[PDB]
Write a protein that holds these residues in place. Structure first.
Motif, PDB file in Angstrom:
ATOM      1  N   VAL A 195       1.013  -1.440  -0.114  1.00 57.37           N
ATOM      2  CA  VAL A 195      -0.473   0.001  -0.337  1.00 57.37           C
ATOM      3  C   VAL A 195       1.049   1.642  -0.062  1.00 57.37           C
ATOM      4  O   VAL A 195       1.957   1.282   1.165  1.00 57.37           O
ATOM      5  N   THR A 196       0.384   2.232  -1.029  1.00 59.68           N
ATOM      6  CA  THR A 196       0.987   3.809  -1.248  1.00 59.68           C
ATOM      7  C   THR A 196       0.544   4.960  -0.089  1.00 59.68           C
ATOM      8  O   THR A 196       0.885   5.357  -0.582  1.00 59.68           O
ATOM      9  N   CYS A 241       1.157   8.688   3.737  1.00 61.60           N
ATOM     10  CA  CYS A 241       1.483   8.624   1.842  1.00 61.60           C
ATOM     11  C   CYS A 241       3.193   8.560   1.733  1.00 61.60           C
ATOM     12  O   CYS A 241       4.094   8.935   1.897  1.00 61.60           O
ATOM     13  N   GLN A 242       3.408   7.826   0.562  1.00 58.56           N
ATOM     14  CA  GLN A 242       4.670   7.871   0.015  1.00 58.56           C
ATOM     15  C   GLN A 242       4.678   8.156  -0.691  1.00 58.56           C
ATOM     16  O   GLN A 242       3.706   9.255  -1.019  1.00 58.56           O
ATOM     17  N   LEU A 243       6.131   9.118  -0.500  1.00 59.09           N
ATOM     18  CA  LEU A 243       6.019  10.481  -1.453  1.00 59.09           C
ATOM     19  C   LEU A 243       5.929  10.145  -2.791  1.00 59.09           C
ATOM     20  O   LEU A 243       6.132   9.385  -3.747  1.00 59.09           O
ATOM     21  N   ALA A 244       5.293  11.319  -3.603  1.00 63.42           N
ATOM     22  CA  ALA A 244       5.077  11.841  -3.995  1.00 63.42           C
ATOM     23  C   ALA A 244       3.488  10.668  -5.525  1.00 63.42           C
ATOM     24  O   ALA A 244       3.011  10.719  -6.314  1.00 63.42           O
ATOM     25  N   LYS A 245       3.098   9.846  -4.172  1.00 65.88           N
ATOM     26  CA  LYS A 245       2.396   8.297  -4.429  1.00 65.88           C
ATOM     27  C   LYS A 245       1.055   9.472  -4.571  1.00 65.88           C
ATOM     28  O   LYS A 245       0.498  10.029  -4.439  1.00 65.88           O
ATOM     29  N   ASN A 304      -0.640  14.436  -4.752  1.00 63.80           N
ATOM     30  CA  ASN A 304       0.260  14.396  -3.914  1.00 63.80           C
ATOM     31  C   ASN A 304       0.775  14.938  -3.280  1.00 63.80           C
ATOM     32  O   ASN A 304       1.051  16.315  -2.965  1.00 63.80           O
ATOM     33  N   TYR A 305       2.084  13.972  -2.288  1.00 54.76           N
ATOM     34  CA  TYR A 305       2.870  15.236  -1.089  1.00 54.76           C
ATOM     35  C   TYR A 305       4.002  14.606  -1.428  1.00 54.76           C
ATOM     36  O   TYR A 305       4.625  13.222  -1.614  1.00 54.76           O
ATOM     37  N   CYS A 311       7.171   3.893   4.745  1.00 55.86           N
ATOM     38  CA  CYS A 311       6.270   2.395   5.010  1.00 55.86           C
ATOM     39  C   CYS A 311       4.961   2.800   5.694  1.00 55.86           C
ATOM     40  O   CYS A 311       5.161   2.689   6.909  1.00 55.86           O
ATOM     41  N   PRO A 312       4.243   3.296   4.994  1.00 56.58           N
ATOM     42  CA  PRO A 312       2.868   4.055   4.721  1.00 56.58           C
ATOM     43  C   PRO A 312       2.245   2.853   5.922  1.00 56.58           C
ATOM     44  O   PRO A 312       1.428   2.985   6.927  1.00 56.58           O
TER      45      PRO A 312
END
Ligand SMILES: [As]
Ligand SMILES: [Zn+2]
Length: 193
Positions: free
Chosen positions: A26-27, A39-43, A139-140, A181-182
């Motif tokens: 999970v992203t 959140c994963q970066l930019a996902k 996107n964060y 690793c969200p």
């Protein structure tokens, strides 16, 4: 400091999220218990807009980040020196902006002339036929404190619905943490409840 008060207003505006769980693959995942997105970066970070009545065309949806901790709340949330300098431009977002929107060519970015705060705005679009809500893919682009530093404040995203003249129609909010690793971090923060 921008208001963070929830406000459904006359259209019955509120937010919804996906129920994505905490698996390693999970992203992007939302904690109802924490009202917090991981959140994963930019996902892709889906946020749903739910209304009881449809706001008029020309309505806009803004996202702004603030720091939760009282001692940092007047600071402008922006990307750390590392992420600001990343070659990750989509040709629309200013490089200092933490929050972007993907998949929308009508996206607009603001550096406030008076407060210096960053925000990102898109046109409000009604749900498609046979859908109950409108989804925006955020996107964060940084967790702010990626490199350390005094400010370890959690970040709050404030979502405002505004009309075409800038009148506030509605407001809601959630905390956000950008991390590798969200799923793991959600599990860990929930354990601490
Ligand atoms: As996310
Ligand atoms: Zn960063």
């Amino acid at each position: 400091v921008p208001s963070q008060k929830t406000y459904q207003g006359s259209y019955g505006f509120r937010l919804g999220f996906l129920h994505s769980g905490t698996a390693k693959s999970v992203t992007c995942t939302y904690s109802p218990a924490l009202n917090k997105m991981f959140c994963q970066l930019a996902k892709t970070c889906p946020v749903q807009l739910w209304v009881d009545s449809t706001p008029p065309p020309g309505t806009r949806v803004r996202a702004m980040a603030i720091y939760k901790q009282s001692q940092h709340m007047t600071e402008v949330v922006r990307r750390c020196p590392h992420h600001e300098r990343c070659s990750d431009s989509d040709g629309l977002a200013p490089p200092q902006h933490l929050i972007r929107v993907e998949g929308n060519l009508r996206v607009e970015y603001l550096d406030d002339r008076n407060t210096f705060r960053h925000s990102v705005v898109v046109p409000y679009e009604p749900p498609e036929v046979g859908s109950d809500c409108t989804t925006i893919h955020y996107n964060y682009m940084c967790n702010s404190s990626c490199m350390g530093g005094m400010n370890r404040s959690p970040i709050l995203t404030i979502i405002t619905l505004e009309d075409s003249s800038g009148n506030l129609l509605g407001r809601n909010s959630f905390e956000v943490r950008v991390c590798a690793c969200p799923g793991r971090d959600r599990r860990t923060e929930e354990e601490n409840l």
